[PDB]
Amino acid sequence: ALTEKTDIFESGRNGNPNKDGIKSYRIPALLKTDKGTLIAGADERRLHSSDWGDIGMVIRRSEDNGKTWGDRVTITNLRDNPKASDPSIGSPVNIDMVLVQDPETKRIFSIYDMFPEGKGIFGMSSQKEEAYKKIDGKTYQILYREGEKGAYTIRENGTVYTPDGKATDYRVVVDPVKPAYSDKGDLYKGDQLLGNIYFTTNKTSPFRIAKDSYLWMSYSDDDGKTWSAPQDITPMVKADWMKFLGVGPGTGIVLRNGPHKGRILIPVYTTNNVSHLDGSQSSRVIYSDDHGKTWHAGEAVNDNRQVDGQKIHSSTMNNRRAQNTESTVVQLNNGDVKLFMRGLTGDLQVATSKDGGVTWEKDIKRYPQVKDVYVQMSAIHTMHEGKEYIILSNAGGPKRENGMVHLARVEENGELTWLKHNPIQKGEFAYNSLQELGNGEYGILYEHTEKGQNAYTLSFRKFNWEFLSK
Amino acid sequence: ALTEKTDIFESGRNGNPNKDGIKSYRIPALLKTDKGTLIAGADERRLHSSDWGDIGMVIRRSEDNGKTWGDRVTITNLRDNPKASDPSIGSPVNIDMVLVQDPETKRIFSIYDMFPEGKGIFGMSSQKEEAYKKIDGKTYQILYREGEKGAYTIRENGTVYTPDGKATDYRVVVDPVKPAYSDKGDLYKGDQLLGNIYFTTNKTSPFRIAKDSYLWMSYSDDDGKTWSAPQDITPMVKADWMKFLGVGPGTGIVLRNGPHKGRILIPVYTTNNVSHLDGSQSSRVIYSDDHGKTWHAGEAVNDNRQVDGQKIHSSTMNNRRAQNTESTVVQLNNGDVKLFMRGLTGDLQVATSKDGGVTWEKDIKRYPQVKDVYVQMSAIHTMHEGKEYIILSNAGGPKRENGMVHLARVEENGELTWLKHNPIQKGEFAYNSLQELGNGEYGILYEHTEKGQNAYTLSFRKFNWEFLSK
Ligand SMILES: CC(=O)N[C@H]1[C@H]([C@H](O)[C@H](O)CO)OC(C(=O)O)=C[C@@H]1O
Ligand SMILES: CC(=O)N[C@H]1[C@H]([C@H](O)[C@H](O)CO)OC(C(=O)O)=C[C@@H]1O
Ligand SMILES: [Cl-]
Ligand SMILES: [Cl-]
């Protein structure tokens, strides 16, 4: 019923780097393509297991349903600041991905966070820095020059314009060409490399982007073999009030029925400037109706939500327990969208959208049958013999341990009836990503450590309906 | 040299209403029109002196340079909520106006704050309510229905639509016809008047607008005699992070030189959700480059301002002493814009814009020569044979008392040198509005009380250069 674990991304041991010089792997995403390929994505955390530093967005492909795996394809890996005093925080950061395939165009998307050099979500400034400027109907990324108040802009061809709208002799690499696109943001004067717009300390160039939270996208048209250069989707989806805006890691969905059929959903979450990570983490989705060309923000589950007899908003809330963070998204046969949200209640929180993920119903459903220890989860839709189900995997607890696979029957009204709860991994268990394999078989890429492994090694297992019914 | 005061708007005495049933007048604006008319604007605060309640936006006209004044013209006066428990707070609020005339079109504009029923800026909720929705490129004001989470919208001809986009048979009066437009916001179901969308308590209708801060505009094309219905300009200028956004009352300007000549400038200020009135009040201007048709927000003086070693932003700041609030705007002959801002340093703070009010230079200039007791001021540009000056008026202190007219020379540098400091009114003195009358004469309209008069009576004086030279 259930296979042995095949390690896909292997972490180092006892606090040391593995043989490739990588201490850590984190944040699995598992995608089954139209060819039948399995794409396994991960944070490649070179220097340590923490949520920052030098991190590549990496995939491996299985052209045989999880039996054997090809070599690592690196989607994006921004080069580190060679002059940073502390290399553990000395790199521009990419962190956390969501994979999805457009079932019509066959395009595969990787959407992931981006920060300039520093500590990621843990090094955000208290004060807003404007990141973008609209000039004659065009949106440009801003640059700040040391000692100057004014907003420089990156305009056509990467050419840097002054605050007062004059071209300079500086340009930015806006069309990176190097492997892993490690030249992105490089700042030139002519053909002299000066530095990089993502460096924040001990800079050798005069320019940097706003110290903010960004959202990037990369895509593949050849089943995950090669990848586009990073596309900055931030200004399409990030409101002025948002502090953090980042993905809920794993695998997104494409709506298969109802008025919004073909819509791509990407779970994300925000914080605000009132209470940031202490009281404002709020789930929502971004979506595309045009096959991934343009992106829109849905409303938050927390927007106009009644809490303890009073209305809150994702932009103003300061309520630790009312937060919802990383989430996993599923569309039902009746057309409802369910959002399963990592939260702080001890048990499973679920929001429902009747309009394709744009707005959410007033109640969040809490399911005591499914434990949540405040950790990522995944959930997928599945049809077994014409009956409708959802499979959800997360840690059983009491800590980030004991991988549980849950089975729910979905009722005609969209309610969830939990049937079975089946252990899939003893010991350490954290982030995971489920897929349908196409028989009655299901795949799962997850975080687990054993035998002194650094957090985490990411492993793959198959399981059938015989395992689910147990 | 200095004329006796002419009382333009007289308040009641000893806490009682005046003959017209008005306890209080506040917030003077004075405008000299192309025809030579003087328009004196005010808040007509019927029930009490505070920053809320039943308040009309009113003017009087003088056709003989301030000697005699006509009857009150009411621009806007929203009807009260007849079912409110406390009438003192039982009315939709208009408060604080800025007057300006377009010298080309001759159109006169009054721009002023709007709040639904409540305590205005002191009654704002801690949580954001979305106020507008963009549906298919069109911006509609949102309505909320009792016991429902969704956003209804006010669409063409005031037809209320359901959250899911269906016409109902509820209608909002979006083209008011009653004197002073007191019918604006009225909620109909067919022929039947049910209540008003600006009412917040003991409602007789199912709908209300978001509890928020709004910005409204009315205009006159007949020299102040008649006025358009209010135009809700909020969505053009109010960013999503903004809590309060309202005018710095008095008289705005039209830029007379430089590449932005013809641009209309209106002083405003905002708060944010981090610190609201405790630490975030931030001066800026909104402006129109198409004769009042569309409006844009400039950047705050506080945006990317260095304060005590560190950069702040108007959207995120929490710094009491770094606030700048109501302000008055002046263009110099060299093209620079000066913004004189009410603040908490005890002396005069001035910001400079080199791009027609869009962005501000890094330093705020303080002038110890001019005390600021934290009260509104007004300032105008003037020429004197043929040297460039600015006249500024405010309280001398210690409190809101001893009105002063200050005179500065505008240096070849754009710097200011304070030459003269002349008392103009003993006893109580608060808000005021200056105008150049022609032939070396100036007019001022200002808040003063005596003989038990309620705060305040608005009185007018004229003065010439010899008054200034003392
Ligand atoms: C962008 C980022 O920091 N992502 C990290 C996320 C985040 O810090 C938290 O969700 C904020 O509350 O948390 C975790 C975690 O294992 O708990 C892993 C993610 O890689
Ligand atoms: C919209 C509004 O409330 N305007 C009021 C303003 C405001 O309350 C303050 O600037 C907040 O800091 O203050 C004053 C005042 O005499 O001090 C008068 C205005 O009518
Ligand atoms: Cl650099
Ligand atoms: Cl009502």
SS3 annotation, A54-106: CEEEEEEEECCCCCCCCCCEEEECCCCCCCCCCHHHCCCEEEEEEEEECCCCC
Q: Which residues of B touch A151 (CB under 8 A)?
A: 304
Cβ contact (<8 Å) for B127 and A311? yes
CA nearest A84: which of A180, A216, A200?
Answer: A200
CA distance A70 to chain B (A): 46
Contact of B458 with B7, CB cutoff 8 Å: yes
CA distance B360 to chain A (A): 9
Based on the fold, state whether residues B116 and B147 are members of the same structural domain. Answer: no
Tokens 């687990």, residue located: A448
CA nearest B297: which of B312, B276, B282?
Answer: B282
Tokens 């956390």, residue located: A96
Taking the C-alpha atoms of residue A7 and residue A91, their distance in angstroms, rounded to an integer, is 27
Based on the fold, state whether residues B356 and B413 are members of the same structural domain. Answer: yes
CA B424 to chain centre: 24
Instruction: Name the DSSP class of A348.
Output: E
User: Measured between CB atoms, does B176 come within 8 Å of chain A?
Assistant: no
Interface of A with B in 322-381 (CB under 8 A): 355, 359, 361-362
CA A211 to chain centre: 20
User: Measured between CB atoms, does A276 come within 8 Å of chain B?
Assistant: no
The Å distance, Cα A124 to ligand 1 centre, comes to 14
Bridge partners, residue A216, by sequence: A112, A232
Based on the fold, state whether residues A116 and A137 are members of the same structural domain. Answer: no
Cβ contact (<8 Å) for B361 and A149? yes
In this complex, the residue of B149, B240, B355 whose CB is nearest that of residue A241 is: B240
**HSE toward the beta carbon, residue A402, CA cutoff 13 A:** 12
Taking the C-alpha atoms of residue B129 and residue B112, their distance in angstroms, rounded to an integer, is 21
Cβ contact (<8 Å) for A130 and B355? no
Buried b (16+ CB within 10 A) or exposed e, A184-200: bbbbbeeeeebbbbbbb
- Please enumerate in sequence order all residues whose Cβ is within 8 A of that of B148, keeping only pairs 6 or more positions apart, or say none: B163
CA distance B79 to chain A (A): 28
- For B137, phi then psi, to 5°, come to 75, 0
Please report, for residues B422, B430, B448, the alpha-carbon distance to residue B425 in angstroms, rounded to integers and kept in the order given: 9, 10, 8
**HSE toward the beta carbon, residue B310, CA cutoff 13 A:** 11
Cβ contact (<8 Å) for A304 and B130? yes
- For A468, phi then psi, to 5°, come to -70, -35
Domain CATH for A345: 2.120.10.10
Contact of A106 with A114, CB cutoff 8 Å: no
Based on the fold, state whether residues B403 and B280 are members of the same structural domain. Answer: yes
Q: Exposed, middle or buried by CB within 10 Å (0-12, 13-18, 19+), for A240?
A: middle
B191 among known catalytic residues: no
Q: Exposed, middle or buried by CB within 10 Å (0-12, 13-18, 19+), for A273?
A: buried
A80 among known catalytic residues: no
Q: Which residues of A touch B149 (CB under 8 A)?
A: 304-306, 361-362
Residue type at position A308: D
Based on the fold, state whether residues A202 and A232 are members of the same structural domain. Answer: no
Taking the C-alpha atoms of residue B32 and residue B40, their distance in angstroms, rounded to an integer, is 9
Is any ligand 2 atom within 6 A of the Cβ of residue B246? Answer: yes
Cβ contact (<8 Å) for B127 and A362? no
Taking the C-alpha atoms of residue B259 and residue B356, their distance in angstroms, rounded to an integer, is 8
Cβ contact (<8 Å) for A313 and B129? yes
In this complex, the residue of B239, B274, B362 whose CB is nearest that of residue A149 is: B362
Residue from A126, A128, A244 to probe the interface with B (highest B Cβ count within 10 Å): A128
Which H helix or E strand runs over A447? strand A441-448
User: Measured between CB atoms, does B175 come within 8 Å of chain A?
Assistant: no
CA distance A411 to chain B (A): 24
**Is the peptide bond preceding residue A132 cis, with omega within 30 degrees of 0?**
no
Catalytic residue, chosen from B326, B372, B428, B447, is B326
Q: Which pairing describes strands A264-270 and A132-135: parallel, antiparallel, or unpaired?
A: unpaired
User: Measured between CB atoms, does B188 come within 8 Å of chain A?
Assistant: no
| For A241, nearest residue in chain B (alpha carbons) | B241
**Of the residues B184, B210, B236, which one is the last residue of a structural domain?**
B210
Domain CATH for A149: 2.40.220.10
Helix (H, G, I), strand (E, B) or coil at A410: strand
CA nearest B142: which of B129, B125, B126?
Answer: B129
Q: Exposed, middle or buried by CB within 10 Å (0-12, 13-18, 19+), for B162?
A: middle
Which H helix or E strand runs over A276? helix A276-279
Is any ligand 2 atom within 6 A of the Cβ of residue B44? Answer: no
Q: Ligand 1 atom closest to Cα of A246?
A: 1
Q: Exposed, middle or buried by CB within 10 Å (0-12, 13-18, 19+), for A24?
A: buried
Cβ contact (<8 Å) for A315 and B361? no
**Of the residues A210, A233, A253, which one is the last residue of a structural domain?**
A210
Please report, for residues B227, B286, B293, the alpha-carbon distance to residue B101 in angstroms, rounded to integers and kept in the order given: 13, 15, 13
Catalytic residue, chosen from A43, A44, A51, A232, is A51
CA nearest B243: which of B272, B279, B269?
Answer: B272
CA B179 to chain centre: 22
The Å distance, Cα A250 to ligand 1 centre, comes to 13
**Is the peptide bond preceding residue B132 cis, with omega within 30 degrees of 0?**
no
Q: Which residues of A touch B304 (CB under 8 A)?
A: 129-130, 149, 151
Taking the C-alpha atoms of residue B163 and residue A346, their distance in angstroms, rounded to an integer, is 33
Taking the C-alpha atoms of residue B362 and residue B320, their distance in angstroms, rounded to an integer, is 19
Listed in order, strand segments (DSSP E) in A281-415 are: 282-288, 296-297, 305-307, 310-312, 327-331, 337-341, 347-353, 365-371, 378-384, 387-395, 401-410
Helix/strand/coil (H, E, C) string of chain B?
CECCCEEEECCCECCCCCCCCCCEEEEEEEEECCCCCEEEEEEEECCCCCCCCCEEEEEEEECCCCCCCCCCEEEECCCCCCCCCCHHHCCCEEEEEEEEECCCCCCEEEEEEEECCCCHHHHCCCCCCCCEEEECCEEEEEEEECCCCCCEEECHHHEEECCCCCEEEEEECCCCCCHHHCCCCEEEECCEEEEECCCCCCCCCCEECCCCCEEEEEEECCCCCCCCCCEECHHHHCCCCCCCEEECCEECEECCCCCCCCCEEEEEEECCCCCHHHHCCEEEEEEECCCCCCCEECCCCCCCEEECCEEECCCCCCCHHHCEEEEEEEECCCCCEEEEEEECCCEEEEEEECCCCCCCCCCCEEEEEEECCCCCCEEEEEEECCEEEEEEEEECCCCCEEEEEEEEEECCCCCEEEEEEEEEEEEECCCEEEEEEECCEEEEEEEECCCCECCCEEEEEEEEHHHHHC
**Is the peptide bond preceding residue A82 cis, with omega within 30 degrees of 0?**
no
In this complex, the residue of A127, A130, A150 whose CB is nearest that of residue B312 is: A127
Q: How many domains does chain B have?
A: 2
The Å distance, Cα A180 to ligand 4 centre, comes to 60
Based on the fold, state whether residues B79 and B185 are members of the same structural domain. Answer: no
Buried b (16+ CB within 10 A) or exposed e, A101-130: bbeeeebbbbbbbbbbbbebbebbeebbbb
Domain limits at B139? 131-210
A367: tokens are 């399911």
Based on the fold, state whether residues B68 and B34 are members of the same structural domain. Answer: yes
Please report, for residues A379, B78, B80, B177, B192, the alpha-carbon distance to residue B84 in angstroms, rounded to integers and kept in the order given: 50, 14, 8, 24, 21
Contact of B219 with B108, CB cutoff 8 Å: yes
Which H helix or E strand runs over A235? helix A234-237
Tokens 């927390």, residue located: A302
Interface of A with B in 1-60 (CB under 8 A): none
Tokens 């986009």, residue located: B165
CA nearest A458: which of A468, A443, A470?
Answer: A443
Taking the C-alpha atoms of residue B95 and residue B108, their distance in angstroms, rounded to an integer, is 18
CA nearest A227: which of A73, A43, A78?
Answer: A73
Q: Which pairing describes strands B214-220 and B231-232: parallel, antiparallel, or unpaired?
A: antiparallel
- Please enumerate in sequence order all residues whose Cβ is within 8 A of that of B470, keeping only pairs 6 or more positions apart, or say none: B1, B420, B422
Taking the C-alpha atoms of residue A294 and residue B430, their distance in angstroms, rounded to an integer, is 53
The Å distance, Cα B209 to ligand 4 centre, comes to 10
Contact of B38 with B23, CB cutoff 8 Å: no
Instruction: Name the DSSP class of A52.
Output: S
Return the number of other C-beta atoms located less than 10 Å from residue B67's C-beta.
Answer: 12
Please report, for residues A228, A401, B403, B438, the alpha-carbon distance to residue B422 in angstroms, rounded to integers and kept in the order given: 70, 78, 8, 20
Buried b (16+ CB within 10 A) or exposed e, B234-253: bbbbbeebbbbbbbbbbbbb
Based on the fold, state whether residues B187 and B122 are members of the same structural domain. Answer: no
B355: tokens are 């791009």
Q: What is the CA radius of gyration of chain B?
A: 22
Q: Ligand 1 atom closest to Cα of A400?
A: 16
Return the number of other C-beta atoms located less than 10 Å from residue B189's C-beta.
Answer: 14
Region for A206 from its dihedrals, namely left if φ exceeds 0, alpha if ψ lies in -120 to 50, beta otherwise: alpha
Helix (H, G, I), strand (E, B) or coil at A157: helix
Q: Exposed, middle or buried by CB within 10 Å (0-12, 13-18, 19+), for B102?
A: middle
Instruction: Name the DSSP class of A321.
Output: G
Based on the fold, state whether residues B238 and B371 are members of the same structural domain. Answer: yes
Contact of B108 with B39, CB cutoff 8 Å: yes
Closest residue CA from atom 15 of ligand 1 = A375
Instruction: Name the DSSP class of A383.
Output: E
- For A379, phi then psi, to 5°, come to -155, 140
Bridge partners, residue A295, by sequence: none
A265: tokens are 């959903």
**HSE toward the beta carbon, residue A233, CA cutoff 13 A:** 27
Based on the fold, state whether residues B285 and B404 are members of the same structural domain. Answer: yes
Bridge partners, residue A420, by sequence: A407
Catalytic residue, chosen from A232, A326, A428, A447, is A326
Taking the C-alpha atoms of residue A337 and residue A342, their distance in angstroms, rounded to an integer, is 16
Q: Which approach determined this entry?
A: X-ray
Contact of A59 with A75, CB cutoff 8 Å: yes
In this complex, the residue of A128, A311, A359 whose CB is nearest that of residue B316 is: A128
Is any ligand 2 atom within 6 A of the Cβ of residue B51? Answer: yes
CA nearest A460: which of A121, A24, A28?
Answer: A28
Tokens 């705020």, residue located: B364
Q: Which residues of A touch B273 (CB under 8 A)?
A: 241, 272-274, 315-316
CA B183, B186, B189, B194 dihedral sign is negative
B417: tokens are 């040198």
B86: tokens are 């406390």
Helix (H, G, I), strand (E, B) or coil at A451: coil
Which H helix or E strand runs over A267? strand A264-270
Q: Ligand 2 atom closest to Cα of B400?
A: 16
User: Measured between CB atoms, does B428 come within 8 Å of chain A?
Assistant: no
Tokens 């046969």, residue located: A333
Q: What is the CA radius of gyration of chain A?
A: 22
CA distance A394 to chain B (A): 31
Q: Exposed, middle or buried by CB within 10 Å (0-12, 13-18, 19+), for B51?
A: buried
Please report, for residues A305, B112, B282, B401, the alpha-carbon distance to residue B248 in angstroms, rounded to integers and kept in the order given: 34, 9, 11, 20
B49: tokens are 């002196």
Contact of B55 with B46, CB cutoff 8 Å: yes
A294: tokens are 């343009």
CA distance A276 to chain B (A): 11
Which residue ranges have their beta carbon within 6 Å of ligand 1?
Answer: A 26-27, 51, 95-96, 113, 120-121, 246, 277, 281, 325-326
Taking the C-alpha atoms of residue A3 and residue A465, their distance in angstroms, rounded to an integer, is 13
A393: tokens are 């995997």
**Of the residues B186, B210, B234, which one is the last residue of a structural domain?**
B210
User: Measured between CB atoms, does A133 come within 8 Å of chain B?
Assistant: no
Bridge partners, residue A406, by sequence: A392, A421
**Final resolution, Å:** 2.0
CA nearest B396: which of B442, B348, B350, B351?
Answer: B348
Please report, for residues A211, A343, B236, B291, the alpha-carbon distance to residue B242 in angstroms, rounded to integers and kept in the order given: 21, 28, 13, 25
Based on the fold, state whether residues B155 and B246 are members of the same structural domain. Answer: no
Based on the fold, state whether residues B188 and B319 are members of the same structural domain. Answer: no
The shares of helix, strand and coil residues in chain A, as percent rounded to the nearest 5, are: 5, 45, 50
